[PDB]
Amino acid sequence: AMQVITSVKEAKQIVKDWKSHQLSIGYVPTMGFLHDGHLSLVKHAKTQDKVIVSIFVNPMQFGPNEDFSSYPRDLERDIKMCQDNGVDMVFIPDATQMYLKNFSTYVDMNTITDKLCGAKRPGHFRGVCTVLTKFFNILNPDIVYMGQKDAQQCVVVRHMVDDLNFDLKIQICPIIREEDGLAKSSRNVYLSKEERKASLAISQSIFLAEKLVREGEKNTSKIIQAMKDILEKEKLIKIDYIELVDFNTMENIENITDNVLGAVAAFVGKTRLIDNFLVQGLK
Amino acid sequence: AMQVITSVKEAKQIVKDWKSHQLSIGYVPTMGFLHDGHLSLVKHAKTQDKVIVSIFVNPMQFGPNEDFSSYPRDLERDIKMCQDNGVDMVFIPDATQMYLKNFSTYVDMNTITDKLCGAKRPGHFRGVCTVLTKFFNILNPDIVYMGQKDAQQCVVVRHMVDDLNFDLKIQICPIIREEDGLAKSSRNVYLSKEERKASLAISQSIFLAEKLVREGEKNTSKIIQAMKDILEKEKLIKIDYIELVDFNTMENIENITDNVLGAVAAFVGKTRLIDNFLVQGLK
Numbered sequence A, B: 001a002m003q004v005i006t007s008v009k010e011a012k013q014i015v016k017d018w019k020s021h022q023l024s025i026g027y028v029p030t031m032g033f034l035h036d037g038h039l040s041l042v043k044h045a046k047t048q049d050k051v052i053v054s055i056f057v058n059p060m061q062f063g064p065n066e067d068f069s070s071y072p073r074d075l076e077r078d079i080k081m082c083q084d085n086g087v088d089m090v091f092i093p094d095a096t097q098m099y100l101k102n103f104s105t106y107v108d109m110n111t112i113t114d115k116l117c118g119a120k121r122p123g124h125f126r127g128v129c130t131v132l133t134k135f136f137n138i139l140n141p142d143i144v145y146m147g148q149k150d151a152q153q154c155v156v157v158r159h160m161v162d163d164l165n166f167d168l169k170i171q172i173c174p175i176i177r178e179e180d181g182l183a184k185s186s187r188n189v190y191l192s193k194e195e196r197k198a199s200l201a202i203s204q205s206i207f208l209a210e211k212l213v214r215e216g217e218k219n220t221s222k223i224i225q226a227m228k229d230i231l232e233k234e235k236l237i238k239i240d241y242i243e244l245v246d247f248n249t250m251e252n253i254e255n256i257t258d259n260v261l262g263a264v265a266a267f268v269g270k271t272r273l274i275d276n277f278l279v280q281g282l283k
C-alpha cells in the first residue's frame, strides 16, 4: 500500500515511524508529470527500505519570464506511476504547507551557481537550495537520487549538503533518453511536431562532442564549434549556451585534462531544453 | 564520563549511537569562556537524556571592527565547568573542521534580522544562521536551549527553524545576572573597574522600564526617555540603540498592547553590551 501525503506533519510522522524500525530511506524529489527518467531514479532508490517521491512545482525556482503557469500537471498520472513502481510515499505538499505567510528564510551560495543556467536564471538556485533544505529536513532521507540531466543542480546540491553537514548522500543517475535521443523531460510536452524534430540536434551535438572527447580531442574551442555547426542547421533553435566546464567548479575549460562537463541549453521555439555529457578520470 | 570532541565525524557517530537507544538530546550552543548564564541553560538541558555543549568562536558572525581576536578563550576553564555540571559531550570544533577550503554556502533571511543589532552588525545573523544550521545538522538535537539575553537571536533562530522545517525546538531561558544586576556575559571580562560601575546603568534602565510597563505605561516614547535619562548620567556610556519593539516582528512600537521587547545596546568604553526585558500577554 502506498501513502499519498499532502501534510508536512503527516509526512514527518511516517518518516519518524520508519526510522524507529531502522529502515533506510531513498528520496526522489521531482516537479511531477512523471516520465521514465524519474522512474529510473525510483528504481535506484529501491535499494533502500522505503522510497519517497515528492511532487512540488516549486514557485521559488521560477521567474515570471519562465513557465510556472504552464508547467504540466497531472497528479492522477503521477500517483498511478508511483503506485505501479513500488513507491512507498508520494509527498505532494501545496505551497501553503511549504511556505507560510511570514516565510522569509533562504539558502544560497557564493560559488558554482553563477555559471551556466544559474547565470541565465537569477534566483533559480536559491529556490532549489531552499526547497531541498526543507524537504531534507522534513523527510530525513539517507540517499537522495538526482539526475545527471540537471548536472549543475547535482553539483550545487552536493556542495550545499557538504557545506551544511546534511547527513545524507546525493546519488547522481544517468540521463534517460527517448528512442531518438532526446533527453526525457516533462517540458518535452510543449514541443510541436516540427520543434521536436529540431530538438534532436541538441542530443546529436552531445553525442558528437562526447565521441570527440573520448577519441582524444582536448581543444574545447574546437569541440564547441563542432557542436555549434550541428545546432545552427536548425532554424527553430536559439542557443542559450554551449560550454565545456570542469565538473567540480563549473568554470570554463580551454584544454581538457582529467574531466569535462559539456553542457548545452537552447530554446526550441519557446521551450528551453538542456542536455549534457560528463567524462571523468581521463589520463 | 564526559567526551571532549573536536571532530565532526566523531560527534556524528556519538549522536547516532545515542539515537539508536532512543535518547533525547539537549543542546547548548556557546562561544566559550563559560559563566552562570551558560550553566543555567545546561541545567534546563538536563531534562533531556543527553546534553551537548558546543564551544566555537564563529568567525562568520564577527566583523573586522569587532572583537574576534580579543574574545576571551579558556578551554581548560570551560571543560572543567561542563564536567562539573553534568555535560555529556563538549563539542569544540576548530574552524577548519567547520569551514573547509571551498565553503561558500549560507543561510539568511529577509525579515527580522534588519532590526536592532542586525542593523548595527552587517553579516552577523547570516553567520549565526549558517553556523547553527551546521551544528543542528551535525548534532541532531531535540531541544536547543538559548538565552533571552540575545533576544533577537532567539527570534531569528526560531524563525529559521520554522521556515526550514528543522525537527527541533528552541527553548528560551531567562537572563542570568551578576549580584548587582549586570547581565552575565563573557565580554564583561573586558570592563575596567570604572567601566563596570558605569555599566550598571544598563540593567538599571531595564529594571525601571519593565516596572513602568507592568504598572500600565503604554507610551514607548516616554519609557525610552526615562531609560535615556538613566544612561545619560554615565559619561563612559555611548548608546548604540534603545528600542521598544514587538517581540515577534522586531518592529518599533509607539503604543504597547499585548507585548513588548525593550532592548538596549551600548558601548561602555570599547565594550559593546546588550540587555533587554520582555513582557507578554498584556491585556
Ligand SMILES: Nc1ncnc2c1ncn2[C@@H]1O[C@H](COP(=O)(O)O)[C@@H](O)[C@H]1O
Pocket: A029, A030, A031, A032, A037, A038, A040, A041, A145, A146, A147, A148, A149, A150, A173, A174, A175, A176, A177, A183, A184, A185, A186
Ligand atoms: N531524462 C532524465 N534522465 C535522468 N534524470 C532525469 C531526467 N529528467 C529529469 N531527471 C531528474 O529527475 C529529478 C526531477 O526532475 P524535474 O521533475 O524536472 O524537477 C531531477 O533529479 C532531474 O535531474
Ligand SMILES: Nc1ncnc2c1ncn2[C@@H]1O[C@H](COP(=O)(O)O)[C@@H](O)[C@H]1O
Pocket: B029, B030, B031, B032, B037, B038, B040, B041, B145, B146, B147, B148, B149, B150, B173, B174, B175, B176, B177, B183, B184, B185, B186
Ligand atoms: N546572562 C545570560 N543569561 C542567560 N543566557 C545567556 C546569558 N549570556 C549568554 N547567554 C546565552 O548563552 C548562549 C551562548 O552565549 P554566547 O556564549 O555569548 O555565544 C546564547 O543562547 C546566549 O543567549
Ligand SMILES: CC(C)(CO)[C@@H](O)C(=O)NCCC(=O)O
Pocket: A029, A030, A031, A056, A058, A061, A128, A131, A132, A150, A153
Ligand atoms: C530538485 C527539484 C525537484 C527541487 O524543486 C528541482 O530543482 C528540479 O529538479 N528541477 C530541475 C529543472 C528546472 O527546474 O528547470
Ligand SMILES: CC(C)(CO)[C@@H](O)C(=O)NCCC(=O)O
Pocket: B029, B030, B031, B056, B058, B061, B128, B131, B132, B150, B153
Ligand atoms: C548561538 C551562537 C553561540 C552561535 O554561534 C552565537 O550566535 C551566540 O550566542 N552569540 C551571541 C553574542 C554575539 O555573538 O555577539
